[PDB]
Amino acid sequence: ECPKWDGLPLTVDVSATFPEGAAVRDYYSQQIAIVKNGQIMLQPAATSNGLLLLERAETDTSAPFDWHNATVYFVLTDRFENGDPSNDQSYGRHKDGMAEIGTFHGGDLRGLTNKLDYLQQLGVNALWISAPFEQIHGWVGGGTKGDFPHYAYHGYYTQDWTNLDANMGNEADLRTLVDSAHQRGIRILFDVVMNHTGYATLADMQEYQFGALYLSGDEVKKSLGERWSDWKPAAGQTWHSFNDYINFSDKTGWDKWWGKNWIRTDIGDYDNPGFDDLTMSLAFLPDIKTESTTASGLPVFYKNKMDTHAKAIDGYTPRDYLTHWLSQWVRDYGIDGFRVDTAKHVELPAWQQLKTEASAALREWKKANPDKALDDKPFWMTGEAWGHGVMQSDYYRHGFDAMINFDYQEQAAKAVDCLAQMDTTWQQMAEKLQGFNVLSYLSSHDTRLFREGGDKAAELLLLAPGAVQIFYGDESSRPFGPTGSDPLQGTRSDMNWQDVSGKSAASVAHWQKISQFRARHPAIGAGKQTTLLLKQGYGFVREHGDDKVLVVWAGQQ
Ligand SMILES: [Ca+2]
Ligand SMILES: [Ca+2]
């Protein structure tokens, strides 16, 4: 079934697609062929995996930006590039000195800035960065076995949506990142959370005077230290054992935290979690009362956090606060979009509200900044709803321009040793997505890293219809990292920069060529597909607007 290949030049019927005598470039090898009998004959480049990325040779620059063609690069900032090591251990955070599974390694906004020319060479149109908001300051026990201290190095444990986390940089650093990204054609997505707050941690309890301990008076100082967060497991204990100093029952102490009006939780005297998706608690993270219709005031512990930018606003609910707070980042910096976490676990009119206010914020920034706005496009919003597929679901009606597509990973794993197998999926996706966008990927921070087939991953991904998501280090086969007893941890390992210019430089160049080809033809991500019948191999035509491409794979070997 799967096509085999001579290893010798390759003859193609371009008779339907390209005029006669016209010049056709193979973007990969750069060879230009003139059509003779409705035919061209090209030898694919050695590093090509049998591909010919046939474009009209008149094309000479990247196509205007379209979300339906977008190449989104998703980075965990702390794990990417350390531009500033003076901010690596903010708020008393330490490294663990034992594998660093869950510590802040130090990646920050200035380093990510440094790396923008690299990213545009990779054909990246959108930069999805992990939430830069101020996280919980300390750590919880990591893995099922208390194997390591787990901090908020990934941005999902937000504590104050109005501040930057000091590990990330300051306001000047964010603005420099966003404006350098825009000057290079790269839009900025923030990763965003409204379902939950971060965990309670020893560092935060000590710093903002909330919660409660079993220890009293001098026992606190005798067992915990001057800095409670600095605790280490004793003999036979694990990193979960610090819980046994914390009294999670105590009403008075735990009411001085977020507040009964803000969250549901087993802790203290708070409304307890529910059993449906909206009101349940994931991984014992407290669920925010997004549906509450009653004015809540600030989180109670903000009384003790003098450096917050949050201000009480008459009649606002928790939802109102979150959507105002999120929107200010857009209004002040011109963020282009949000990727929304745990979207199944918050009611849909809350996301719609978030989208309403974020769009007004982006419009308002672009009007204030006509020199910095690349264009007039509205705010964009994508969402992680677990296991969503290629369907225009209810999410589309409530503010989501595109959902993350979980079904592509397995579809691409099937076609590792035969690009041709993607055809079915590629036909359906090209058809279906004439009416809506999705975001597809190979590697995820909460699934696995796609490392089969080496750099074949490139064409498995970048040829997808719809917007695609390069998980950072896909281009360089970034290894799965230390993980301990949390199976997902190794997916968040350091970018392998040494490999980028050494052992993996060929993989990166392969990715570069295929991704530039995509950036150069909106037909790839948005066109309709006709699959060709050829004498040797697999191939297809994509066509959208006035843009046609022909993509041919020779065969195995
Ligand atoms: Ca740093
Ligand atoms: Ca919820």
Author numbering: 120 to 676
Quote the study's own text:
MalS is an α-amylase that breaks down maltodextrins in the periplasm, hydrolyzing the 1,4-glucosidic bond of amylose and long maltodextrin to release maltohexaose. MalS degrades linear dextrins by recognizing the substrate at the non-reducing end and preferentially liberating maltohexaose.
The conventional C-domain of amylase consists of amino acids 120–180 (N-terminal) and 646–676 (C-terminal) in MalS, and the whole domain architecture shows the complete circular permutation of C-A-B-A-C in domain order. Ca2 is located in domain A, while Ca1 is located between domains A and B. Ca2 is situated at the back of the active center, whereas Ca1 is located near the -3, -4 subsite binding loop. In MalS, Ca1 was located around the -3, -4 subunit binding loop, and thus it stabilized the loop formed by residues 397–406 and participated in substrate binding at the active site. By docking the substrate to MalS, we confirmed that MalS has a binding pocket capable of containing 6 glucose units.
